[PDB]
Design a protein around this ligand. Structure first.
Ligand SMILES: NC(=O)c1ccc[n+]([C@@H]2O[C@H](COP(=O)([O-])OP(=O)(O)OC[C@H]3O[C@@H](n4cnc5c(N)ncnc54)[C@H](O)[C@@H]3O)[C@@H](O)[C@H]2O)c1
Ligand SMILES: NC(=O)c1ccc[n+]([C@@H]2O[C@H](COP(=O)([O-])OP(=O)(O)OC[C@H]3O[C@@H](n4cnc5c(N)ncnc54)[C@H](O)[C@@H]3O)[C@@H](O)[C@H]2O)c1
Ligand SMILES: NC(=O)c1ccc[n+]([C@@H]2O[C@H](COP(=O)([O-])OP(=O)(O)OC[C@H]3O[C@@H](n4cnc5c(N)ncnc54)[C@H](O)[C@@H]3O)[C@@H](O)[C@H]2O)c1
Ligand SMILES: NC(=O)c1ccc[n+]([C@@H]2O[C@H](COP(=O)([O-])OP(=O)(O)OC[C@H]3O[C@@H](n4cnc5c(N)ncnc54)[C@H](O)[C@@H]3O)[C@@H](O)[C@H]2O)c1
Ligand SMILES: Cc1c(CN(C)C(=O)/C=C/c2cnc3c(c2)CC[C@@H](N)C(=O)N3)oc2ccccc12
Ligand SMILES: Cc1c(CN(C)C(=O)/C=C/c2cnc3c(c2)CC[C@@H](N)C(=O)N3)oc2ccccc12
Ligand SMILES: Cc1c(CN(C)C(=O)/C=C/c2cnc3c(c2)CC[C@@H](N)C(=O)N3)oc2ccccc12
Ligand SMILES: Cc1c(CN(C)C(=O)/C=C/c2cnc3c(c2)CC[C@@H](N)C(=O)N3)oc2ccccc12
Lengths: 260, 260, 260, 260
């Protein structure tokens, strides 16, 4: 009987044990919560399926946010199992890798632009919509994962900075739209962490050595710290907070410039 | 021989004499600038043609930013007449009217989302791409028109707030990509102004009366003030300014709350 | 002893049961923490003495933040009782009441400015300094209470918005200075709450009805919501968070404007 | 007959020809404006006299902003000569040198804190107060100089970041207070420039070499660019802009991190 004793949460975005969604579910489950999970397609089905079993869960549903139907169906199927929900966790983001390696103006084609904002920004809205009925039942909350690359230019993040900026806008518009139903909508601007989202980025290690050099805490954050922060926002202790972007980056965002 | 004696500028987004692009072109031409124009489709050709000649210009090219080819071709044809360019003004934006009338989570369908970010956000980048060669010739600048609904939730702006947030992020990513070539990329966060962008918005009228009550200057801004500010950002006096979001809103953005 | 099992915390700024520090101390003690308290002068001593005892504490020390000596003594005396500290909560703020009633520029005198910035902004730094030794012992954290009037113009806040702006800056400079010692420095930007800080503000009730009308959650925050958030920032779950300004305002900060 | 034909502006803060105030006066005077000048004390009197003489001005008044009388007197004396004013330029800032060399928590004593916010933050309000009557005559404007060190932690800026945060807050509270009378209150967040404000800072060259390495334009800004930007804000072209913090930093503020 911890903090989330009796609470339910759906965790979309578990791709590996390094995924941020993993540390969240772990932190949430640690406090007594019951978890549900989605996977983008069959290839991930079996992996997410027993990630669920780690958390005492057998609720694993296919949800490709690119498909409108999959979203509603994934929530249709979930309505079949659960009465309501105390929160939905959206840890999804993607852009064609070519748009993230090279010059912004060059690699940012129309299609690469379309994909980035659809999967990474609109999905949180489409999910929030399909998830709205179940969230109201328990005055649940909504949580997404953003990155300060929306507010500040990082090399090679490119259209993902545009997407995250759009996402952050959606959080405010969702929190404002869903605030009347007791549904808090918040986001976490988490520091850089080497997950499966770092594959293909040749500069990452230098970037990590760099973030380590600038962060006020002189270190990079972990999915546990992120998970605990997510755990808080999804908790009754975070009842008075909506539309907030919380920076779990070791204060990195607050530094103008560091010793050479 | 005024301030822009001998400078050239392409004005995309002139649809009538109310268009913000119109008040900008007015300010530029007033200071000796040379003007070129595009139109979204044939229906506007004769109207833009008519405005172009009004400013001593006969350079009018079809440019539907939804079409990749139309963008580059409009710039291909423009290269035939002009050597280089000192600045590109991006006053274009659009989202399906249904996505701008009603509840955010509800009315924001996937397609309305795609269109909003495509026409209003990606186009400035695609244009920025197609315009680079002419900009490099004269170390021109880039200017777009944003709205503070990206930073704060306004009713009925909905997916346009996500788009403008993406746009404003792109400005930073563009200014950073094109900064090594002397090309300044900036944006103006202009106060609300009753142009053809207000068609279909039933609440616009009350919205305008509100800004009037809150803006520190107790008034709404004009396309002249926006045009005069745009004229400046496109001017050598703004040489030490890139990636800047300039708020020409009579200070409304800086007010937390006003007398009841 | 749940989250704050075995932790010690000094709470300066307990003036009544409505004080934000009160709801904070409540949340901390609720989670098993041992509490210490300061009082500004003799008149409050017996109340703070009594306030400490409500939380199983008899460690009550005089701390007038205007006096450098009074500051250090309270921590000298505290050093006598406690080895180290897991966090210091700075819930202090003050400006001459005249500076908060009328137009900002008329009422903003030099001394009212001096007092406001002295007591409300420098105090967190002087305290952070005198408290540094005890924080290093346990790598404690620092927490202060800010107000969004620093980022946005509210009527009658006047020099307190300038002071809060300085304070919020100090948090970043403190978090960066004390971050190498494991001391996270954060702040909570709490929504408006009718505490003893509302005495003399004739407009409070209308303002409270206003935030109630604007906050996405359609309500005003409580010292419990504020206290729980402080509990988090003072908790190991907030280990990856420093220099952060956390908004416990029911998302009010995220609303550009709502139907009036 | 340029842009400021017939406009008057007072330039407080001219200490040398490198001072930002100098490049502004030059830019304003270049466009036909008439100039007045103050000096902090006797030692600078003859020097300010000489610069005023450069700009066709012999209006030089003693103004130590630390003395309330000097402020009002300087404006009393100025009111005698000029009818009204189209703008007041506040280019003053100071903090005890000891508070700007070392660790923030250490060197920030109570007095060093008092002085910094007094001279650098309160002066703009006291001057804005003493300047209000002359500004109303011509619907003048107010301009101050801020630094992004208020929003982000720079090494050794320390308490000056708190002051700049207060200063920047005052701009909004001033712009909001004076906006109803047509007086626009704005500020320029100018990049680092080696003026007489850099004396005693051993780290400057590395800091400057860094900004040069990070600034999107790969260069540092000049007082001419700042002066031209100030000229704009003090101009009718900036009529729709109040309470705005304009970043003349070569876009440096918009960069999260650069190639190592
Ligand atoms: N890794 C970082 O440094 C970082 C920092 C800040 C924010 N974020 C964001 O946090 C979120 C989680 O990233 P991560 O670190 O866990 O990497 P990850 O690859 O381990 O997890 C991201 C998940 O998005 C899923 N996904 C992608 N496309 C999908 C689709 N069409 N339908 C359904 N699911 C889809 C992926 O399957 C994956 O599980 C992302 O949005 C990311 O942008 C990441
Ligand atoms: N009108 C306001 O209140 C206001 C305030 C602040 C910012 N803005 C934004 O600044 C810009 C100024 O717009 P405006 O005031 O001149 O209104 P406007 O309607 O007159 O101009 C918008 C132009 O975008 C063009 N356009 C739309 N879709 C296109 C496409 N697929 N291809 C090519 N062109 C296309 C339209 O033809 C139009 O000329 C807009 O982006 C607007 O969102 C508007
Ligand atoms: N109530 C709100 O709406 C609100 C919202 C956001 C932030 N805050 C801030 O929270 C903090 C606590 O205020 P509150 O709302 O709990 O009201 P409060 O009156 O109960 O507490 C204010 C505290 O300021 C302390 N103080 C003042 N001068 C002092 C001195 N010279 N020496 C030592 N201590 C001194 C006092 O100990 C007092 O307890 C304030 O800084 C306030 O600005 C308040
Ligand atoms: N140097 C930069 O990079 C930079 C950038 C942005 C803003 N600023 C700030 O804007 C202003 C521009 O500074 P600068 O570059 O011209 O350096 P500067 O040293 O040449 O000018 C500072 C002036 O403030 C005057 N002054 C100091 N104390 C005073 C007092 N008690 N009363 C009256 N006057 C007093 C000084 O005499 C001096 O003329 C400063 O406040 C500065 O902090 C500086
Ligand atoms: C930091 C940082 C991140 C992590 N992060 C904040 C994200 O949101 C990550 C988005 C992201 C989306 N799509 C991707 C990839 C990543 C690469 C995985 C690959 N498998 C792929 O095809 N597509 O990504 C970066 C990219 C460039 C520069 C910096 C960063
Ligand atoms: C403010 C404000 C604006 C002006 N503004 C800042 C914009 O950027 C306006 C974008 C906008 C894009 N697409 C539109 C329309 C407008 C309506 C024209 C119609 N013809 C249409 O089909 N599509 O529009 C609003 C809409 C709803 C709520 C508030 C606002
Ligand atoms: C909101 C809001 C607050 C609460 N809050 C966020 C604060 O930070 C409160 C500061 C504050 C500082 N000093 C004060 C007082 C208040 C009045 C108590 C009295 N005892 C006094 O002498 N001095 O106060 C306001 C004042 C004017 C307008 C709005 C507000
Ligand atoms: C950058 C940067 C600046 C320039 N800048 C933006 C400012 O506003 C500088 C204000 C400033 C105020 N007071 C000062 C001094 C400067 C040193 C002159 C000396 N004579 C003194 O006693 N007092 O100053 C810095 C100080 C430390 C670290 C970095 C910087």
């Amino acid at each position: 009987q911890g903090l989330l004793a009796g609470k339910r949460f759906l965790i979309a975005g578990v791709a590996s044990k390094l995924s941020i969604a993993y540390g969240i579910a772990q932190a949430l489950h640690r406090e007594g919560a019951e978890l549900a999970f989605t996977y983008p397609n069959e290839k991930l089905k079996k992996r997410v399926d027993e990630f669920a079993e780690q958390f005492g869960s057998k609720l694993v549903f296919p949800c490709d946010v690119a498909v409108d139907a999959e979203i509603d169906n994934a929530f249709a199927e979930l309505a079949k199992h659960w009465d309501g929900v105390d929160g939905v966790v959206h840890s999804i983001g993607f852009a064609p890798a070519h748009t993230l390696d090279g010059d912004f103006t060059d690699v940012t084609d129309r299609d690469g632009f379309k994909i980035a904002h659809d999967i990474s920004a609109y999905s949180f809205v489409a999910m929030a919509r399909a998830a709205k009925p179940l969230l109201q039942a328990r005055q649940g909350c909504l949580l997404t994962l953003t990155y300060q690359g929306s507010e500040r230019v990082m090399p090679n993040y490119n259209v993902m900075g545009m997407a995250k900026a759009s996402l952050e806008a959606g959080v405010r518009y969702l929190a404002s739209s869903l605030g009347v139903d007791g549904i808090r909508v918040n986001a976490i601007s988490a520091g850089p962490i080497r997950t499966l989202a770092a594959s293909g980025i040749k500069s990452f290690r230098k970037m990590l050595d760099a973030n380590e050099k600038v962060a006020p805490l002189k270190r990079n954050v972990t999915i546990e710290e992120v998970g605990n922060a997510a755990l808080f926002l999804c908790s009754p202790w975070a009842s008075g907070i909506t539309g907030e972007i919380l920076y779990v980056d070791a204060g990195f965002n607050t530094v103008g410039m560091s010793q050479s």
